[PDB]
């Protein structure tokens, strides 16, 4: 009784650095639609066996969704290091949720490249588990103030991608969604 | 590993030799990809520069930005480190993410002597950056009167 279509069959999506924070409750979720989706190939699901998660139903249905490059989809895994996992998006360890990723090159591709998506490169702090830290301030490598005007080593925050029609499948960006399920001390859970 | 990088920063010539005689990797780098040839060039430790290249230091090493130690030497204003790297076979046409050549870097800070050193090994006078500006175009903006003459003479 909740719109999983508008998060699955949508057309406007966020990026790695600004993944959408969504909370959904008070409905029923058709878990079986994934097993017969006929379009999912990377159902590397975690935390609970696909067959066990069917009957159970709880709160904290936190959902995440963004895009990622092709060959680096494996970096999305709890307790596993990676370029995004170490600098762009931490995964809360012991993650008792489930993830879905698939290839959708038919719509997220244009001639000449798609220079809209970006990702960060460096930071001072560390990626705490389940943290999104959007920022625009530029870090520094020297005491010289790069105050807005262009400079040598003032750590320009993000760099874009290129999604050309001739790009290979392995380099083609895959759409990824993330689901988590656990409980809070408050009783009377809401099923799905 | 970690010892060799910080030793290159501190300018410890003797500490360089003890660790390098231990079989340490000559092309080790930090998470940012900074090889210790970068550190020796940036800090201006001429003695460390000579020692590393003797046993096969990566003269074309690049960081996450693609920076070369020649770029650091050119921008800092180090005289004899630049030439010895060119003697070892340093590349001159490499462009970073911004596309700045080592010739461009000397133009910004007015390092006159570095300009001819790279030019003697074949530095491109008409090189473009990401903005399309040249080292000659750097001179007119920064008000360096003399530096524009050398590039124009070689134009």
Concise overview:
Chain A has 192 residues and is mainly beta. Chain A has helices at residues 5-8, 32-35, 52-55, 83-88; strands at residues 63-68, 97-103, 118-120, 158-160, 174-180.
Count of discrete alpha- or pi-helical segments spanning 4 or more residues of chain A: 4
- Tell me what the CATH architecture of chain A is: 2-Layer Sandwich
Rg of chain B computed from alpha carbons, rounded to a whole number of angstroms: 16 Å
Annotated CATH topology of chain A: Alpha-Beta Plaits
The tally of beta strands of chain B, per DSSP, is 0
Write down the secondary-structure element order of chain B: HHHHHHHHHH
The CATH superfamily name of chain A is Spike protein, C-terminal core receptor binding subdomain
Q: Which structural class do you get from the secondary structure elements of chain A?
A: mainly beta
Main sheet record of chain B: none
- How many individual helices of chain B? 10
CATH class category name of chain A:
Alpha Beta
| Gap from first CA to last CA of chain B | 45 Å
Major beta sheet summary of chain A:
3 strands, antiparallel
Strand order of the largest sheet of chain A: 1-5-2
Rg of chain A over CA atoms, rounded to whole Å, is: 19 Å
- How many domains of chain B? The number is 1
Helix % of chain B is 40-55%
How much helical structure, as a percent, in the residues of chain A? under 10%
PDB class: viral protein/antiviral protein
Keywords: DARPins, Anti-SARS-CoV-2, therapeutics, covid-19, VIRAL PROTEIN-ANTIVIRAL PROTEIN complex
Assembly: dimeric
Entry title: Cryo-EM structure of SARS-CoV-2 spike in complex with FSR22, an anti-SARS-CoV-2 DARPin (Local refinement of FSR22 and RBD)
